Amino acid sequence: ELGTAFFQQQQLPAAMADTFLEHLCLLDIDSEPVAARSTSIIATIGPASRSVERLKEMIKAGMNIARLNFSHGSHEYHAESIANVREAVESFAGSPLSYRPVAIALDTKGPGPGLSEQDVRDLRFGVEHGVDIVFASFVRKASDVAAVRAALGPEGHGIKIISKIENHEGVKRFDEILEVSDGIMVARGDLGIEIPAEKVFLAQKMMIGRCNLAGKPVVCATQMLESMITKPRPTRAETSDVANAVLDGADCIMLSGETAKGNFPVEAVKMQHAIAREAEAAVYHRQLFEELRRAAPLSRDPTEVTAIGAVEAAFKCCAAAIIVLTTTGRSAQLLSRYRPRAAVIAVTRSAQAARQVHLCRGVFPLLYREPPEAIWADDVDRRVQFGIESGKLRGFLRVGDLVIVVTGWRPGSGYTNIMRVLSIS
Amino acid sequence: GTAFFQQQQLPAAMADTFLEHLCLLDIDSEPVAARSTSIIATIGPASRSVERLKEMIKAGMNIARLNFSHGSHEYHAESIANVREAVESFAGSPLSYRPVAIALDTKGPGSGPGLSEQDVRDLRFGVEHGVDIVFASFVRKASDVAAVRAALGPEGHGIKIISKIENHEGVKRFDEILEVSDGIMVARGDLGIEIPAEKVFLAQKMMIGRCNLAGKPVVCATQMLESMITKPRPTRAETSDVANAVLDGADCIMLSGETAKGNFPVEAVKMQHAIAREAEAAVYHRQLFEELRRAAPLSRDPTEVTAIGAVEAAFKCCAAAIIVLTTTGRSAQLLSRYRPRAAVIAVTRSAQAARQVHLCRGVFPLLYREPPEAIWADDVDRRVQFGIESGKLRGFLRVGDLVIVVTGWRPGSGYTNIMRVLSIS
């Protein structure tokens, strides 16, 4: 029904193995990736990637999140970067085949015992300019996150807080930090200086695993393709690092000086895209999903229950995609936490949410703009078909394919409770 | 609550190993769940009175077996009439009415190589009188099943064929027999004579396991509580046998002499009910579900996909029940095959499907008698409410409990594709 050639692609013989050792032995270099690249790419916006024309090329190469490093440059400079990014993103708003929303992240300068005076001004700037994510520098304890949450005035409560663990104190207080944070960033640059360089990989692997268990996005950062600042190709250690960060379970991967000041910014985005696609295919979903399932506590939350039921169903039929109607992005995040092999096409009316779901691995946002139907059930079905139309368009779906549709019983966020098995018409 | 997690061997079912599970079995941990394993009671002079049968229904008789090896067609027609009169004596309360299937156990081929002439007449009688299940005696190969299917004719298309494996040939050709049969019966009486008595348990355990893997109902039969033919209580070996048949994975357990001619017909049914309730609580669902999940093949069938997703969701929230609408009973059978701990409350308008689902373990049928609503979605919701009301009335459900609702996208059999997480109001 699917074919012998289908079961050779995207490391399907390796993922069917009864053991992890057998899985490794079945990894085929001739087994090509079919699924879209799920791990998002954070690109640092600097002089080498600041023109509306250069930004248009980086969006095409695969940039999902645009990072503004507030350690360098004025508020006036970063406001122009925000405008150039928004102008480059809206240049494809006519065509829904090239239109992809891009999140804007503010990376704070850093602390001093707590939130610095400059950081309060920078955070206030981010709120006034509508940033989606905040990369809080040098988070040490839960009170540091609370300080950043407080500095995000009456307005900025929707902004996501990704705590950067860059020192020994934060590594030790990790559990309390993650509890109050929206996600974590393994800031390996400063971490490699505060703690022994040979212990950084344990912190990365521990934090990624704990984030995966918690269901919160984790970013792997610093020197991923460092040689790409001056060279067109990365070293064997750099491609290995990127691939292993994806394998560890990182939701996002990041380019710092490779995109901000490097001679090769578009090339680095293209390279990260290529390695991520390969690595995701080699993920051992059999053990991953069973462990995530066993480790996850029992839940009486319909969204959480529908999320595991949907991912279970998606694996059973090899669903092409899981279409989820979300408003805040929560439902899509809860699907992503179980690491499905099917792309989570998330249809939202919230432009902020559509940008913010790039933080979650495997979530492909669609901003649906249409005017609402008088009947709610009809409005839900127009958003579902919109999911299918775009899926068909961007290569995810073909007629005959199976998809899992996740919706709620009534309007408003938090009522997700339905999972539907749908055949593409 | 604390008290909830002490009942129905919940500490034992949470164990990381099967050895730990056994060590955590508490005799003071009472069963809460309803008895899922159905009870087949052989009809005889000890069980023909309408008043007596009413007591047997109350004790838990689900299937009434008519042994065609004894008695005339006239005799069995009076049996059918007494079973039906006794079952219909509780039709006045449709939320607490228990349907009872009627199974015809053929005389057999005897000396003959295939379907005997008497068997053709008996099968035609079964069809004319509306039997639900046929227990084909001495099935030796797949052609024997085909012969019985042919003898039922076009009017007996709906009747289920449970092949009785009673000899060595039938044990060897098991795979071909099970392939063409609706289910199997481990006929231990004749099997204990055809094969060495000390090898019968291996045939029982093999057949039960293979049936469980296939998703087809399996019946454990003969001498389960033999001493109760004359004595008020069974031996320590008999209670152990019944409990182990349930633990092995038998969908149904059966009483022959115990209910046909014995002095304790009602008490035998009460005893089997009691042991089954205890055994089901002690089932190690942690390993059972994970093995059944792993062993099941990939499917592109929406009913099959929704079934595994629903059972997975039911386990995540400790669902009180899974309410499924079904025409043929297939949807309920597909939920049953994954051995959920939640009761599969199956609502159906088909009286034959409601009787036949007793073959599947954990399926509690409800016959919906109301005439259809003009709007199909309203008619579906009225049947879901009928299920919640009967569930609440019979003690399956309490307000605050979570329930998984399984429905389809259009009327008619084959279209189940929706799973819904619902909280009892």
Add this chain to the structure above:
Amino acid sequence: RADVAQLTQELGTAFFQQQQLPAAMADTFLEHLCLLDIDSEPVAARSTSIIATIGPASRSVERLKEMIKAGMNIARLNFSHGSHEYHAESIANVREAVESFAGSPLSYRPVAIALDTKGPGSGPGLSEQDVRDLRFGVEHGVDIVFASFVRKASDVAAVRAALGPEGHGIKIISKIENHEGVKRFDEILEVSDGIMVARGDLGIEIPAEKVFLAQKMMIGRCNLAGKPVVCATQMLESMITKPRPTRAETSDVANAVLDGADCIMLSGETAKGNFPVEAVKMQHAIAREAEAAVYHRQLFEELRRAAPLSRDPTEVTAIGAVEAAFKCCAAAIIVLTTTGRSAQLLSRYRPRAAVIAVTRSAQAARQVHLCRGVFPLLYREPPEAIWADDVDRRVQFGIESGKLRGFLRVGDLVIVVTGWRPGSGYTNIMRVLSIS
């Protein structure tokens, strides 16, 4: 199949069809059940020991000789019936029947003698009659005591005190027959040498439909502890009057073995039944089948995960030896034991290889029947001047009795477990040997 492709070519495809070997190689328990073949015959010797109650139907020296041949390992004397004089004659008839095969020490089968106490009855502890019966057992050299109605750890202490200083070697198997005993099980097992699941009284004290949970829990806890457990009462009840048992009785016996019972017992089936030798033969047949169908893959891995880390050389050598035995499909594990402890420590890991235990102690040789898979050999030769030579002569005695009784054939691999110095407690050496 790559993890058996080489050994299937060597040992053969016919070897890997017998004793439910395709079923035991399955990756899941569900797959194991699907691979159970009725045409797969048992090759190994019957490991689960058979306790037979000695009564009028099984008292003559000639009848006892037939029951030993049929497979009786332990002879139970029920002190709830009969006088001390009566039980002394039973002891004499059993000993006479056992010693009638002493002429061939490579094919002589030792039989343990167990005393089943009358019980406390109305009383709160050890009855006055029980004290007299226990002193009788000590005076007559019984190997095991089946303490009736044990309810707390103080009850077993009372029985150990009543045996006195002369009855220190006797094993105490506590019978759990009531709700109190089931609840205080952990404290009872801690101070007892083993347990007996007395299902007759247990089926009366607790609901009959709850007895199987108590049996399965107690057996599992005993298996975890490494102590012998006995399944008792109504196992083949219909054979008291009938030549063949019911489908429920064969099922019960097979399931008790599967649960992990070290011993199975015949009460009124042999004491007063019309077919006492037939019941022993039947229990032997069902046990051999059931042991083959044991899912050793998960059983051994669970027993290893559940067992705590040990710094005891005997305990360490025991797990290392059982692991080695499984790697090469060892025909047997030959262990030199004084008290039986080393053989008990091998048994707790439930090896598929037969634990052939060579001991000079006649009481230990009788008492190791309590452990499943231990086949005792009583070494009667006088010691060699060199200890290493004396050890090698006992190892050869084991290989010769193993070859003679069919356990071993030339080409088979065996695991030899010995110590570094004489005396009990010094087991620390494991040796892989090929049968010559």
Add this chain to the structure above:
Amino acid sequence: AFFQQQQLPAAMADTFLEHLCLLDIDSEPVAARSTSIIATIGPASRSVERLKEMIKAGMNIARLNFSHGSHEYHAESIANVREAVESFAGSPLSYRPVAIALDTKGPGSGGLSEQDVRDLRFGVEHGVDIVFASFVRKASDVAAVRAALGPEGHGIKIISKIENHEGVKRFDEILEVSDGIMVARGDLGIEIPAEKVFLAQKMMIGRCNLAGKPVVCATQMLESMITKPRPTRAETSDVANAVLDGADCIMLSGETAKGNFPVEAVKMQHAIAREAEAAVYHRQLFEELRRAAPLSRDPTEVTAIGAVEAAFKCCAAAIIVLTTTGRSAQLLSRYRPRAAVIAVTRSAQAARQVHLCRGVFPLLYREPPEAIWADDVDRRVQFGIESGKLRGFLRVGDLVIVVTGWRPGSGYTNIMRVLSIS
């Protein structure tokens, strides 16, 4: 305090996800570094004084790249390495043997090139222990190298370098006839897409681990350390992941041969390896290796599993094995024990060659045989306990597993013994 060190809370976890969550940066490694370090000998690491520092930093195998330099040049490198290694021979309980590996030029456009035959003959004449065969494509290429060593080069180990697509495809036939494999990522990253190299590395390492043969991870492991004193976050990650994958050896190419920091790179690889080995999830690893290993009727193979199982039960400090060829130690290594495999051998070539196996710590026994064989065996077991105690592997009170045979000569290993230290 013992159960907090060397990631013991993480290794006790019931799941691999839980294992990752329990990784503690404050949990220090106690055990010795098992993964061997191959250092490429070049101009930056040629002096006897510089080599002595690299031996102290952790070098176990010295690689001679025959793609550059004359036979005269490589003979001087061999002499300088041997002089630096023998400078610590005065203390035989704390002397570290170093293997010498010859990395062939390759076939290039061509089977076995004419230069390769001359280079292989040179290695035989100079007593090399290992040969890193460049660009192996099929089983006949390995046979060609074995033929070129001749009758004098039987003892030399052949590590086939998989550097192209053909070699990756015919991997099963190559590994079957080779002594081990080297994942040559430099050329492999050019022949196949760079983003597919990690799949080849992970596949080859897993297949080698299954086979029980040594595997080497090679090229650009700490590349930035050629010009900088510290590596990038990607490079430390790469090294740690190669160890985690199951590589028996890790290699420094231009980082030791021509880099400004050759001793620093050896020190860095040692540090990352020690940390990574502690974070290995032995619970699942040993159970998977046990399940995956076929049944064997070979006493050495059987005693090897039995000994590793016993070592895990008592948390044995070390497994002392008496070996002649190194085979018994290799068979213990394949089950990846947490206990150090202290291997006592009289053969100097075997003692150098066991660096190819992860977790095998060679000891060269330099005393002449006792008249009684049992006494000679006990003296070698004591030599192992004394060197263990001396080098910090053992403390009084620790438990050790001793693996010996029933008679002298190779292939008769069949005994396992539980021993308590002093």
